[PDB]
Design a protein around this ligand. Structure first.
Ligand SMILES: *Cc1c(COP(=O)(O)O)cnc(C)c1O
Ligand SMILES: *Cc1c(COP(=O)(O)O)cnc(C)c1O
Lengths: 807, 807
């Protein structure tokens, strides 16, 4: 190949001219950078051409606004979307280096946190693959959230210094910087409303390429860094300036800060992305090749609000249009509603974001005025349609009364958007009928569903090339951009060759992940054991404790009859606890405490191993998901909207043990519920238990295997040196357990036995797996994005065709 | 040429892949950057090879430590030292751009201030041209000193945001960062002295290439940026951290800060460069290919102290050697004295740098201990050689008594260095016999002279290619690296062709600078008028006022007899005033006030124009010096050590009006005093006037042209709206004038008449010019550096021969 020679020549060129190093002084990190630059150069040609193409053809632009972008690592994705993986592997080998070693030096982008952020990243990959003129907008968080470390079995938060050595992917655009205004006061003058005496924070843009899979599109993620404007002063004025500089820069410091007016910092962050972004969208709109003029704005601009975090987009668009662009209020409002769309990710109305009005009086006095005007006009309309309905007016109002007046940002999003969607079929029904019941009665057509999805490139082609090839051999390459083509795998459940091939891939993946496990955690991993994986946020509603009780029950069962034939398990539990969440940190400690007992018991041996997977991130998900046999998706029914981890396990050859909630429902409906290990209380059963009243004591008293497990946890069997360590866990499970852990224990145990009986038969296990994989095509973010594009954005995929670039 | 095609291809490549731009979105600044990168790539090959060569051949390394590096602009110097000027000019033309326009977009590096900084930059260029293994070490000042603006005839200081858009020349080395310690306390333990509880500031290195002229050497300038280490805290601890972060970062904010414990900030800056640098020098020494071991240190390392600013090098080298490297005190001291050398730039002992010991007690307690030990051992030696001489001990001590104990940093430099030099022959005699009289008596051999110099590349080949070619045609190219070869021009004073050629070059230069003048200042410049140039620091001792009085006298002379034939003059006065220097700001105002009257008087017309050259910098020196007919070097005799501006005018075809002091003396001695316009009080005459007592009133009273000029200044003729504006100027000239402005007025007037009579005869003017240029070869920094290398560093130039690189 001439390709292998080009990468080799480009790597050395970057090493000498970009890094200003030679092979004697270079570190592995320098080698990662040299390669990352080599690979980025292949994107640049397409990136320039793509932006030249959108300027020429002026397509409708999609703006995806999120406070989270859980991007992971970029080197591998970039290499695969450009087809250069094989050429780089060989070039790096010939250079005396190891591609996978270099891949491990890259930092996980500290730009996301959980589901909401990964959803944004999958979306961006799909929008680029579908040829949409899409731009991701967010904050360039300098220190991510935090890297989880486990010290003495407890979680410790370490700072995520991911930009320490620089990010090779991003380009700084200091020339496209915009001012963000805070505080000040508002004056009504004859020339229009003026927002005066404001503090100014500068928004500095950094652009990152978002490549399309096997097309020529390379889109942009534009992330803003907070910087103070520089400069008279007395001693006090000098200290005021240094502090304002620091408070400016900590807007883009960490995701979801705590600090207790660190809530004011969250509001500042929200406005900082909104104002930065909207000024950029408008500037792009009026700077079009060949440009009263704002009437075409809803035809050239869609703004998607990923949760209520970017909710200020509504009154800020109203502000720029009316106070700067001199557009008439009514016209600006009809423009606002048509440009904005809102996606909700939560169930029950109390999770929805609220801000005190007093906080708005101080930080954003002009936006408060606009919000008040939007609300009044909205309630006049409601009063016209439903005369004398006084309680309807209070329910539908964006401003709520209580111990202080508050602004319901969700209500503001509903009123200022043309479309409102939930993230799964039943969640979207709850969004309609319960969360925004009154809004649904007034405008049913506004409310929609956009079932979540995952990208088939990262969550298959990247993390599981072995499985990807085995599917490619049988049904060709077209499924990678049209994942519903995996249904052609259905007849292959009879094929003895395919079954032994899918099983071989899984075991290869299991062996590669065992090697990571033994090296890092120092536990002897059984290769023939079943990989039982539960990876998500440590939270009571997610019920890692339910999984803990199962593990203790199994430990006790091996101890009672050590001669008995037992299905071997490697139980992996991972996830980050919120720093101030006392119960979740107790739970992490329980898992490691259980593991200490289980993994060091000589009677137990190679039958049961328990590991807490430290620092669950995007990059680690890509190692563990392809190696999983069983996926635990065991949240209490009625708590989960969707879930995307569910989808990742289904595509990578794992069977699912779960409740009938969130994504599991649509996964059952796609593959048939018999191919999934559904158990426990149904949404309606949970409600019926609340009518009876949950008495967890009755369960503990009349379930012997559970009583033994809880007593061990309580008495200090898993914590000999500090026997009251889990007192608050036990106290919660018996008296305050809102998530009904005991109520689902029996059903969960019985269900795990059915899992054990199926794993005992390798062929029928893998047959059920093939049925899962073949019916997962629906859960492609391509499908989700095509849905958003046609039913919300009014754009057609592949209507823009970027041609091969010029160097 | 294949060269023109390569630059074109590299520019576009940098524009696309480095800048991530196309020609539609690119600004002229992007074009400057694209070109700057193209050109830097040619240095990199040599830069890598040079550092590979010094590692292989382990030569003795020269470390030039300065708090100032007045580098100017780099694009032109870089192009000429690589021979790519012509190829770039053509490539940029073919691209549709203008090289000189792009050259003007580059910022003057805000790394220097005056003479001391430019000396450092000329030295670095010479050391590279001579093939020395030389490293410049200093501070990367983020905001320079200040850009001078003239608003309403007064100086305003504007912030020098020179790094705003980035520096294309430098490479960040965050991996070679070193800690700097401050404060803390000191503990004597059995394992040696320990410096504990210190605050730590990080020194982040940035490397800049220093190319040799027509050789393959590219050396390094290593400049340190102050950064705080990142991270528990209460409300107060948080504010303490934010302030310490800011105080850390303002170490590398501005040159010579004011802030009144902004003196503590100067001390911090001094230590920050010393500690950063010495740790780097040692790390390089022990990391040599194949490395008790410190005995070879004085043979592999020379540290040159450019003034007392890096004086802490002595006790810090002692600290690292004894407390870290476990070297014996006596051995470490003999190593210290042999590695360090000190250059003094001042006359009279009261200008020498002192710090209160209390400030050292707090900021550097371990260095104070070391200084006290160095001093005691030094005074024991003095006590041995001169027993019972109690006053000799007090004079020779590094610690002085008074309103508080103080550390004389100059005494510390003398005691801890093997060599001590002045910067001109007579200044070096004063350094020996007066400033350090007692030290000279004890060790005469330590004391030396190293007459200053300027680089022939920047101060001839770059700023004056026209003159450079006219010399190249007659004596070939060898003078550019052996400037004493300009003596071959001496017989050409008879050559009628050469004389008219040198005059043609001057007039071309005058015309190009008139075009800059008319465009920027909006005054009609007479092309046949004499360019009278006085560019330096605005200070009473430099006597811009003496030049002001001459200009007023000439204005008055044209007004008395407007019909009379008068030699036309363009008088240019430039220079920056220290922000707190009331008299110097008054002086700038006087010049602009005079100009307002002179330049707008219709009786005067094209005979006399007065301009204040705004923001005298390196880049502006390169425009004005080649266009000058007359160089004013008029400081009071006995005040100037050397001067390098003097030298620049002499090389570029200007005649010198000056006093018999500093560089003027050696310039007279080189070209013969008859070829220079020497006037006024001699050093000995100044002393004799102090014996008589200077009564400036006697001069004002009995010199009518002066009385008229002073009365106009006093009465408000030059300031109609604020007639008492120059009251403090007049009050000073009559009662407190230490610089004897009136005493030299008559001699200066008479001398200017001789200048007027010579300019009246073009041929004899240019003959005298040729005599100046031909005898300027001595004032090459190559000569100075060869001198330092052989008489101080013990290195031979051209003993290291870097071979052509590999790409
Ligand atoms: C896909 C993914 C998630 C989402 O998991 P859910 O519990 O389904 O919300 C979270 N974190 C990471 C690292 C992921 O890759
Ligand atoms: C050469 C130079 C100097 C030194 O001038 P002196 O008065 O001779 O010390 C100062 N500033 C600039 C910009 C120079 O180029």
């Amino acid at each position: 190949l001439g390709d292998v020679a080009e990468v080799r020549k480009s790597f050395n060129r970057h090493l000498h001219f970009t890094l200003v190093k030679d092979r004697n002084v270079a570190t592995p990190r320098d080698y990662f950078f040299a390669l990352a630059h080599t690979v980025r150069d292949h994107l640049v040609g397409r990136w320039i051409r793509t932006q030249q193409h959108y300027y020429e053809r002026d397509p409708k632009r999609i703006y995806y606004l999120s406070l989270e972008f859980y991007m992971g690592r970029t080197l591998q994705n970039t290499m695969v979307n450009l087809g250069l993986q094989n050429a780089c592997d060989e070039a790096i080998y010939q250079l005396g280096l190891d591609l996978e070693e270099l891949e491990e030096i890259e930092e996980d982008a500290g730009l996301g946190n959980g589901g909401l952020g990964r959803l944004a990243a999958c979306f961006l990959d799909s929008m680029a693959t579908l040829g949409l003129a899409a731009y991701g907008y967010g904050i360039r968080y300098e220190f991510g959230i935090f890297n989880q470390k486990i010290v003495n079995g407890w979680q410790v938060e370490e700072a995520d210094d991911w930009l320490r050595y620089g990010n090779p992917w991003e380009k700084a655009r200091p020339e496209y910087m915009l001012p963000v205004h805070f505080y000040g006061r508002v004056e009504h003058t004859p020339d229009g409303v003026k927002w005066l005496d404001t503090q100014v924070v500068l928004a500095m843009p950094y652009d990152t390429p978002v490549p399309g899979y096997k097309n020529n599109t390379v889109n942009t993620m534009r992330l803003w860094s907070a910087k103070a404007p520089n400069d008279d002063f007395n001693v006090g004025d000098y200290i005021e300036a240094v502090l304002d500089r620091n408070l400016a820069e900590n807007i883009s410091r960490v995701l979801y800060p705590n600090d207790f007016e660190g809530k004011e910092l969250r509001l500042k962050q929200e406005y900082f992305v909104v104002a930065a972004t909207l000024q950029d969208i408008i500037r792009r709109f009026k700077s079009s090749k060949f440009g009263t003029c704002f009437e075409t704005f809803p035809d050239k601009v869609a703004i998607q609000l990923n949760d209520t975090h970017p909710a200020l987009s509504i009154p800020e668009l109203m502000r720029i249009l009316v106070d700067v662009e001199k557009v008439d209020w009514d016209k600006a409002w009809e423009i606002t509603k048509k440009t904005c769309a809102y996606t909700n990710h939560t169930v029950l109305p109390e999770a929805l974001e609220r801000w005190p009005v007093s906080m708005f009086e101080k930080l954003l006095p002009r936006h408060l005025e606009i919000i008040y005007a939007i609300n009044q006009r909205h309630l006049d309309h409601v009063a016209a349609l439903f005369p004398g309905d006084v309680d309807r007016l209070r329910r539908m109002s964006v401003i709520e009364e209580g111990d202080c007046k508050r602004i319901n940002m969700a209500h503001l999003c509903v009123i200022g958007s043309h479309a409102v969607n939930g993230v799964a079929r039943i969640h979207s029904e709850i969004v309609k009928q319960s969360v925004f019941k009154d809004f649904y009665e007034l405008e049913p057509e506004k409310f929609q569903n956009k079932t979540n999805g995952i990208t088939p490139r990262r969550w298959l082609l990247l993390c599981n090339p072995g499985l990807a090839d085995t599917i490619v051999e049988k049904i060709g390459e077209e499924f990678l951009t049209d994942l519903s083509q995996l249904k052609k795998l259905l007849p292959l459940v009879s094929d003895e060759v395919f079954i032994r091939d899918v099983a071989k891939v899984k075991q290869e993946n299991k062996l590669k992940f065992s090697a990571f496990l033994e090296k890092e955690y120092k536990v002897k991993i059984n290769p023939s054991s079943m990989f039982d994986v539960h990876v998500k946020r440590i939270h009571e509603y997610k019920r890692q404790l339910l999984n803990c009780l199962h593990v203790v029950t199994l430990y006790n069962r091996i101890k009672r009859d050590p001669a008995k034939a037992f299905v071997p398990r490697t139980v992996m539990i991972g996830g980050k606890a919120a720093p101030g969440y006392h119960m979740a940190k107790l739970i992490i400690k329980l898992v490691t405490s259980i593991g200490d007992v289980v993994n060091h018991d000589p009677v137990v041996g190679d039958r049961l191993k328990v590991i807490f997977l430290e620092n669950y991130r995007v990059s680690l998900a890509e190692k563990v998901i392809p190696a999983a046999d069983l996926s635990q998706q065991i949240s209490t029914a009625g708590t989960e909207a969707s879930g995307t981890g569910n989808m990742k396990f289904m595509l990578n050859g794992a069977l699912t043990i779960g409740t009938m909630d969130g994504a599991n429902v649509e996964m059952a409906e796609e593959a048939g519920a018999e191919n999934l290990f559904i158990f426990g209380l149904r949404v309606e059963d949970v409600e019926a238990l609340d009518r009876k009243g949950y008495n967890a004591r009755e369960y503990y008293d009349h379930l012997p295997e559970l009583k033994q497990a809880v007593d061990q946890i309580s008495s200090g069997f898993f914590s000999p040196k500090e026997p009251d360590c889990f007192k608050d866990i036990v106290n919660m499970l018996m008296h305050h357990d809102r998530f009904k852990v005991f109520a689902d224990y029996e059903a969960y145990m019985q269900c795990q036995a059915q899992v054990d009986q199926l794993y005992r038969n390798p062929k029928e296990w893998t047959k059920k797996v093939i049925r899962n994989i073949a019916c997962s095509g629906k859960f492609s973010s391509d499908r989700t994005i095509t849905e958003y594009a046609r039913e919300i954005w009014g754009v057609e995929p592949s209507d823009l065709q970027i041609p091969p670039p010029n160097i």
